[PDB]
Amino acid sequence: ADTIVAVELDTYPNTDIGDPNYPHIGIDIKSVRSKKTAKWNMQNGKVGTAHIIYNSVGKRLSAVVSYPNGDSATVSYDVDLDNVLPEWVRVGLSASTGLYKETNTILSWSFTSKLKSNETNALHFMFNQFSKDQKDLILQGDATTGTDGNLELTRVSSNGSPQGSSVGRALFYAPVHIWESSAVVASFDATFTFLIKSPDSHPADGIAFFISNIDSSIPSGSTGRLLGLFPDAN
Amino acid sequence: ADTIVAVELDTYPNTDIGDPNYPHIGIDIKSVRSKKTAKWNMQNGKVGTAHIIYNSVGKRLSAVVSYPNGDSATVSYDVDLDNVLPEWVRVGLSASTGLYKETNTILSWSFTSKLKSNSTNALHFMFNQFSKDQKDLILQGDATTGTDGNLELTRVSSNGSPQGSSVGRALFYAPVHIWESSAVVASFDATFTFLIKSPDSHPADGIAFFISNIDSSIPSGSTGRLLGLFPDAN
Amino acid sequence: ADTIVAVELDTYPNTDIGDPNYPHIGIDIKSVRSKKTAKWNMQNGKVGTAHIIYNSVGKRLSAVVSYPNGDSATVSYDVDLDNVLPEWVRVGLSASTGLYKETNTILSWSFTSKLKSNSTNALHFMFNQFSKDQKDLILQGDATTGTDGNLELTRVSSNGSPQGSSVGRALFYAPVHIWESSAVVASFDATFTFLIKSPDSHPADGIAFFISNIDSSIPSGSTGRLLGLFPDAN
Amino acid sequence: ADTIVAVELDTYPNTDIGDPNYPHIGIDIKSVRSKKTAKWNMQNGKVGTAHIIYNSVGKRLSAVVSYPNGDSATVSYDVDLDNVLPEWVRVGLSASTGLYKETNTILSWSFTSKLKSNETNALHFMFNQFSKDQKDLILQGDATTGTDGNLELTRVSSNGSPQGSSVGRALFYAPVHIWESSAVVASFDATFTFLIKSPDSHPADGIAFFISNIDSSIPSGSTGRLLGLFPDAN
Ligand SMILES: CO[C@@H]1O[C@H](CO)[C@@H](O[C@H]2O[C@H](CO)[C@@H](O)[C@H](O)[C@@H]2O)[C@H](O)[C@@H]1O
Ligand SMILES: CO[C@@H]1O[C@H](CO)[C@@H](O[C@H]2O[C@H](CO)[C@@H](O)[C@H](O)[C@@H]2O)[C@H](O)[C@@H]1O
Ligand SMILES: CO[C@@H]1O[C@H](CO)[C@@H](O[C@H]2O[C@H](CO)[C@@H](O)[C@H](O)[C@@H]2O)[C@H](O)[C@@H]1O
Ligand SMILES: CO[C@@H]1O[C@H](CO)[C@@H](O[C@H]2O[C@H](CO)[C@@H](O)[C@H](O)[C@@H]2O)[C@H](O)[C@@H]1O
Ligand SMILES: [Ca+2]
Ligand SMILES: [Ca+2]
Ligand SMILES: [Ca+2]
Ligand SMILES: [Ca+2]
Ligand SMILES: [Mn+2]
Ligand SMILES: [Mn+2]
Ligand SMILES: [Mn+2]
Ligand SMILES: [Mn+2]
């Protein structure tokens, strides 16, 4: 199957597959079952920012998700991505809804990858606006691009209303050389801003930044808790 | 045909199609017939650096090609690329050889594009090493990468000898949103380092940084003086 | 006297010293009388963005001022800053009021200078928030920072009314190496956002991004039309 | 006393003050006795690169030192710099010699600090060439800027012989806002390349990248094992 590294913003506690019992940020290493999570107070209708940092030297992948009021959740996990990911990846954003739903609107997304040495290859991109025809994004599933200049990872009605049973991803068009055996530093960071809104009995299921093999597609049966990322909950 | 914007480092004077009567740098707007050129002292077997800058605000596309000894050639041309390129492009490097030849070796290539509203979309990439399998490059024609870490735009026979009638291009894999209706600034810059060596009677034909439609292909019969860029010399 | 290169967002037409008879953006080289201006529709109480770009290849000092509604004014002047500016400079933002006044509120300020040859010396700074004690800014005259996170270049009264006869500047703390003899490309760009509000008839006098000798000081009497930049209107 | 956070490339084992008995990279928090070290194979006369990474999410101060042959040593220490450093700092490079000596030649140095949110303040500087009058560097002690275009932190004799009992530092001219209470991510990276040569088969004492109070100066008697950083070996 695909190889996945993700930072999930998991709005829906699927405790029966190992979620903690609250919305959480988590770090997923080849499994929807986060290796580390932190409780996350998802702020309905508020614009959140998720910052993801992989420090290749410290071998530590960290994430924070914050809201303008300063409330944040952080998670770090010690991992050497050289041992996890293929050298070449796509990077992307994934979201899903299930029986419960929420908007999984991306308002901005940037990524920087650097491979040093022995000089530097780098890739940076920044989206503060997404066009109707956002040619440098591979949209998968229900993901669509704006207006309102946004990336809507999952189905939302034109009049704002999240759809259940939706899964969508957007991967940057170019493959990213995420590590190299001879790379002294293979670091990357990503940030995205998001607006998760639910009228629902509960928001679900979340948004993930993910890093996948280049040919990654939405696994069959990965709406809901899986979060467009994984074929199963193992 | 394709829509081409290029900075050519034209090593071979094809005076019958309007080249000046010397190696030159030129700015090509939809035609191999440079809109502006500057005499360029190509330094055989030395590593040169081409810096290309497009100032969206000043509407000026500028290039300098320099060598470590300080010798440089400069060309500017006033142009509004909004009126020239499609909104979405690929960027790349092209080189060709004809009846005469040269190595068209790219040692590094970086590109930065920014679309500014007040919010910014940006793309930056940097290649200081090219891998044998450089997945974020579209190699066209004779272009190859590695394992010496270089991008060889045209055929070079392994003991280092350039091949005649060779054309090759490397385009960045992702499409580039190079201008937008709504962009107050749609600037970009590109840098590449190159090694043109010719054992010959003359080097030919040159290297170009180019910006083309996304689906740009080497036009048929564009080895030689057409630099892998144009179908004809109009 | 200081050496001043400035981009002025001149809100008040001082036609007696060669302002055109409208608000304008201007390129100033060692005179407050801009070498080039463009008519500027200043939008009272709206956040404008000024982008300023220069490189030593094109040698075109360009500036655009835009507002979110999409109105922009652009001015460019070819000028070889090697022959104007000292090698080392400070960069800054300056504003003034005279008989008439306006808030000259700076909301953000970014600047990048680069000196390139082989593959670079660079400086980049970005302020999206100014601190009450912004230790990397030299505030001169009436300029103040914080706690609203803004830089107020000129005097704003407690009731929000801007004051007349005010001048203030902020320069980045470090000297900037703006050109270097052996640099193949010396480039800078600057971006700032500003909020010019004038409760009535008329806003004055303007805001400028400037580059000056490192010890640059507000010239005495440089309120008003001298924009905190020039000792006189010559 | 100054507050010092440093990454030391310690060439000389001072086992009497708790160095391990081999050249090492160390993370130093308010003591010369590194909180963490890794064994470092210092390659005399080869150009090394140190990369130093920290962000306030992962709070892992990481450093790698590498050489072009691909030998590297890495050290990381989780430390909450919010609780160590003043909010504003200067950043610098320091080196020393004592009884034994080495050139402590800096060939490049770059640095980026960013404070996100809710947007970004950033500082970036890069020196690949140092100048004789490098106005954006505060040189302390024996530190000199060339040509050769290098920063020589410690005294090197006319005949190229490094001198003993030398200490010198270069700090970037502007204060750096290293953390901020409301910032979701405060990050810094530093890289420098260095050339440590000892004719005397006995190199000492090392080079450090350091972050200190803005008024940091070379502690008296901080030659030798104190690396120009600490007043004592506590
Ligand atoms: C065993 O009963 C299950 O109940 C849950 C929730 O009622 C449901 O989960 C679905 O919706 C959630 C939230 O969107 C997702 O996390 C799941 O993948 C799934 O789609 C099950 O379907 C069952 O009814
Ligand atoms: C009419 O005679 C032509 O002369 C030139 C050169 O002798 C030749 O051009 C070919 O080679 C050059 C140099 O590589 C290229 O610029 C051209 O495109 C072409 O391939 C013509 O073929 C004829 O000989
Ligand atoms: C002519 O005497 C003055 O009247 C002018 C206005 O014409 C005034 O100018 C001051 O204010 C303007 C607008 O703010 C500035 O551009 C000038 O530099 C100056 O400050 C004079 O001060 C007298 O009142
Ligand atoms: C013990 O008396 C000293 O001998 C030591 C060497 O053990 C010497 O130390 C100096 O040199 C080392 C290596 O350069 C530094 O690490 C020390 O700080 C110091 O400068 C003493 O000075 C005496 O010679
Ligand atoms: Ca879940
Ligand atoms: Ca030609
Ligand atoms: Ca005026
Ligand atoms: Ca020691
Ligand atoms: Mn989860
Ligand atoms: Mn030509
Ligand atoms: Mn004016
Ligand atoms: Mn030590």
Residue with the two structure tokens 């770059």: D110
The yes-or-no reply on B/D contact (3 CB pairs or more, < 8 Å) is: no
> CA A73, CA A62: separation in Å to the nearest integer?
11
> CA B12, CA B96: separation in Å to the nearest integer?
10
Question: What's the number of CA atoms in the CB half-sphere (13 Å) around residue A25?
Answer: 23
Resolution of the determined structure in angstroms stands at 2.0
Q: Is A97 helix (H, G, I), strand (E, B) or coil?
A: coil
Q: What is the CA(B204)–ligand 2 centre distance, in A? A: 9
> CA D191, CA D214: separation in Å to the nearest integer?
20
Q: Is D171 helix (H, G, I), strand (E, B) or coil?
A: strand
Residue with the two structure tokens 């402590």: D104
B-proximal residues of A, 88-127, CB under 8 Å: 88, 108, 119-127
C-alpha C217: how far from its chain's center?
14
Judge if the upstream peptide bond of residue D205 is cis by omega within 30 degrees of 0. yes
| CA B158-B160-B162 angle, 5° bins | 100
Report the gap between the CA of A116 and the closest CA in chain D (Å). 10
List, in sequence order, the alpha helices (H) in chain A: none
User: Does ligand 3 come within 6 angstroms of the Cβ of C225?
Assistant: yes
Instruction: Report which protein residue has its CA nearest ligand 1's atom 8.
Output: A99
Q: Got the DSSP string for chain B?
A: ---EEEEEEE-S--GGGT--SS-EEEEEESSSS-SEEEE----TTSEEEEEEEEETTTTEEEEEEE-TTS-EEEEEEE--GGGTS-SEEEEEEEEE-SSS----EEEEEEEEEEEESSSEEEEEEEESS--TT-TTEEEEET-EE-SSS-EESS-EETTTEE-SS-EEEEEESS-EE---TT-SEEEEEEEEEEE----SSS---EEEEEEEETT--PPTT-SGGGTTT-SS--
**CB C221 within 8 Å of CB C120:** no
Partner B contacted by C70 (CB < 8 A): yes
Q: Got the DSSP string for C98-127?
A: SSS----EEEEEEEEEEEES---EEEEEEE
Is A205 flagged in the annotation as binding? yes
Phi, psi torsion values for A224, nearest 5 degrees: 65, -135
Q: Is C35 helix (H, G, I), strand (E, B) or coil?
A: coil
Ligand 4: residue of D99, D218, D227 to mutate (most ligand atoms within 8 A of CB) is: D99
**Beta strand spans in chain D (E):** 4-10, 24-29, 36-39, 47-55, 60-66, 72-78, 88-96, 105-116, 120-127, 137-141, 144-145, 151-152, 167-172, 176-177, 185-195, 206-212
> CA C78, CA C36: separation in Å to the nearest integer?
10
In terms of Cβ atoms closer than 10 Å to its own Cβ (0-12, 13-18, 19+), residue A217 is middle
Q: What share of chain C is helix, strand, coil (3-state, %, to 5)?
A: 5, 45, 50
Phi, psi torsion values for D2, nearest 5 degrees: -60, 160
**CB A197 within 8 Å of CB A100:** no
Instruction: Give the Å distances, CA to CA, from C38 to B61, B221, C197, D25, D155.
Output: 21, 46, 21, 57, 55
User: Does ligand 3 come within 6 angstroms of the Cβ of C98?
Assistant: yes
**CA nearest A122 in B: which residue?**
B126
**CA nearest A174 in B: which residue?**
B174
**Subunits close to A (at least 3 CB pairs below 8 A):** B, D
Region for B41 from its dihedrals, namely left if φ exceeds 0, alpha if ψ lies in -120 to 50, beta otherwise: beta
Length of chain B: 234
> CA A52, CA A61: separation in Å to the nearest integer?
7
* Of C40, C41, C37, residue with least CA distance to C7: C37
* Of B6, B2, B11, B65, residue with least CA distance to B203: B11
CATH architecture of B1-234: Sandwich (2.60)
What is the residue type of D56?
S
User: Does ligand 4 come within 6 angstroms of the Cβ of D187?
Assistant: no
Phi, psi torsion values for D225, nearest 5 degrees: -70, -5
> CA B98, CA A51: separation in Å to the nearest integer?
51
Q: Is D158 helix (H, G, I), strand (E, B) or coil?
A: coil
CB atoms within 10 A of CB D144: 18
> CA A96, CA A82: separation in Å to the nearest integer?
28
* Chain C residues within an 8 Å CB radius of D175: 135-136, 173
C-alpha C11: how far from its chain's center?
13
Report the gap between the CA of A181 and the closest CA in chain D (Å). 10
User: Does ligand 1 come within 6 angstroms of the Cβ of A205?
Assistant: yes
Instruction: Give the Å distances, CA to CA, from D202 to D75, D98, D218.
Output: 24, 11, 24
**CB A160 within 8 Å of CB A104:** no
Phi, psi torsion values for C188, nearest 5 degrees: -135, 155
**CA nearest D89 in C: which residue?**
C135
* Chain D residues within an 8 Å CB radius of C121: 126-129
* Of D173, D99, D185, D168, residue with least CA distance to D137: D173
C-alpha B56: how far from its chain's center?
19
> CA C62, CA C75: separation in Å to the nearest integer?
6
**CB B76 within 8 Å of CB B60:** yes
* Of D6, D181, D213, D2, residue with least CA distance to D89: D213
Q: Which ligand is nearest to the CA of B11?
A: 6
Q: Collect all residues with Cβ–Cβ distance below 8 Å to B14 and sequence separation of at least 6.
A: B224, B225, B233
> CA D136, CA D91: separation in Å to the nearest integer?
12
User: Which long-range contacts does C198-202 make (Cβ < 8 Å, 24+ apart)?
Assistant: C198/C11, C198/C44, C198/C100, C198/C101, C198/C102, C198/C103, C198/C162, C199/C161, C199/C162, C201/C100, C202/C11, C202/C12, C202/C100
- Show me where the domains of chain A are located: 1-234
**CB D55 within 8 Å of CB A62:** yes
B-proximal residues of A, 172-201, CB under 8 Å: 172-177, 180
> CA A212, CA A90: separation in Å to the nearest integer?
5
Region for B181 from its dihedrals, namely left if φ exceeds 0, alpha if ψ lies in -120 to 50, beta otherwise: alpha
C-alpha D185: how far from its chain's center?
23
Question: What's the number of CA atoms in the CB half-sphere (13 Å) around residue A199?
Answer: 8
What the block records as the tokens of C212 is: 């000056």
Q: Collect all residues with Cβ–Cβ distance below 8 Å to B66 and sequence separation of at least 6.
A: B48, B49, B51, B72, B73, C117, C184
* Of C126, C123, C176, residue with least CA distance to D127: C123
> CA C90, CA B92: separation in Å to the nearest integer?
37
**CB B164 within 8 Å of CB B97:** yes
Is D225 flagged in the annotation as binding? yes
C27's enclosing H/E stretch is: strand C24-29
> CA A86, CA B66: separation in Å to the nearest integer?
38
**CB D193 within 8 Å of CB D106:** yes
Q: Is C197 helix (H, G, I), strand (E, B) or coil?
A: coil
> CA C73, CA D176: separation in Å to the nearest integer?
34
Instruction: Report which protein residue has its CA nearest ligand 3's atom 21.
Output: C99
What the block records as the tokens of C105 is: 């509120």
- Four-point Cα dihedral D207, D212, D217, D220, nearest 10: -70
CB atoms within 10 A of CB A201: 8
Of A51, A57, A63, which has the smallest distance from its Cβ to D53's Cβ? A57
Q: Which ligand is nearest to the CA of D32?
A: 12
* Chain B residues within an 8 Å CB radius of A214: 135
Question: What's the number of CA atoms in the CB half-sphere (13 Å) around residue A207?
Answer: 31
What is the residue type of A8?
E
Q: Is A46 helix (H, G, I), strand (E, B) or coil?
A: coil
**CB C153 within 8 Å of CB C93:** yes
* Of A153, A145, A135, residue with least CA distance to A205: A153
**CA nearest A66 in D: which residue?**
D184
User: Does ligand 3 come within 6 angstroms of the Cβ of C171?
Assistant: no
Residue with the two structure tokens 């010399």: B233
Q: Which atom of ligand 2 is nearest to the CA of B14?
A: 16
Residues paired with residue A54 on neighbouring β-strands, in sequence order: A61, A188
| CA A198-A202-A205 angle, 5° bins | 80
> CA D82, CA D63: separation in Å to the nearest integer?
18
| Inter-chain CB proximity B128 and A136 less than 8 Å | no
What the block records as the tokens of B65 is: 């090609």
Q: Is C16 helix (H, G, I), strand (E, B) or coil?
A: helix
| Inter-chain CB proximity A135 and B177 less than 8 Å | yes
**Beta strand spans in A34-184 (E):** 36-39, 47-55, 60-66, 72-78, 88-96, 105-116, 120-127, 137-141, 144-145, 151-152, 167-172, 176-177
* Of B102, B88, B124, residue with least CA distance to B199: B102
The yes-or-no reply on B/A contact (3 CB pairs or more, < 8 Å) is: yes
Experimental method: X-ray
Pocket of ligand 2 (CB under 6 A): B 12, 14, 97-100, 204-205, 224-225
Instruction: Give the Å distances, CA to CA, from A109 to A184, B17, D105, D153.
Output: 26, 46, 40, 41
Per-residue DSSP letter, A148? S
Q: What is the CA(A215)–ligand 1 centre distance, in A? A: 28
Judge if the upstream peptide bond of residue D118 is cis by omega within 30 degrees of 0. yes
The per-residue b/e assignment along C112-144, b for 16 or more CB within 10 angstroms, e otherwise, is bbbbbbebbbbbbbbbbbbbeebbbbbbbbbbb
B-proximal residues of C, 32-61, CB under 8 Å: 47, 49, 51, 53, 55, 57-61
**CB D230 within 8 Å of CB D219:** yes
SS3 letters for D56-110?
CCCCEEEEEEECCCCCEEEEEEECCHHHCCCCEEEEEEEEECCCCCCCCEEEEEE
What the block records as the tokens of D232 is: 């004592």
> CA C107, CA C149: separation in Å to the nearest integer?
7
User: Which long-range contacts does B66-69 make (Cβ < 8 Å, 24+ apart)?
Assistant: B66/C117, B66/C184, B67/B43, B68/C117, B68/C118, B69/B43
Q: Which atom of ligand 2 is nearest to the CA of B204?
A: 14
The per-residue b/e assignment along C52-76, b for 16 or more CB within 10 angstroms, e otherwise, is bbbbbbbbbbbbbbbbeeeebbbbb
What the block records as the tokens of C26 is: 């201007």
Q: After which residues is chain B broken (C to N over 2.5 A)?
A: none
> CA C124, CA D126: separation in Å to the nearest integer?
9
Q: Is C17 helix (H, G, I), strand (E, B) or coil?
A: helix
The number of C-beta contacts closer than 8 angstroms across A and B is 72
* Chain A residues within an 8 Å CB radius of D59: 76
> CA B69, CA B66: separation in Å to the nearest integer?
8
SS3 letters for A167-194?
EEEEEECCCEECCCCCCCEEEEEEEEEE
C39's enclosing H/E stretch is: strand C36-39
Residues paired with residue C9 on neighbouring β-strands, in sequence order: C25, C207
**Beta strand spans in C71-178 (E):** 72-78, 88-96, 105-116, 121-127, 137-141, 144-145, 151-152, 167-172, 176-177
Per-residue DSSP letter, C63? E
> CA B50, CA B31: separation in Å to the nearest integer?
20
**CB B186 within 8 Å of CB B195:** no
> CA C60, CA C77: separation in Å to the nearest integer?
5
Region for B215 from its dihedrals, namely left if φ exceeds 0, alpha if ψ lies in -120 to 50, beta otherwise: alpha
User: Does ligand 1 come within 6 angstroms of the Cβ of A204?
Assistant: yes
Of C51, C60, C184, which has the smallest distance from its Cβ to B72's Cβ? C184
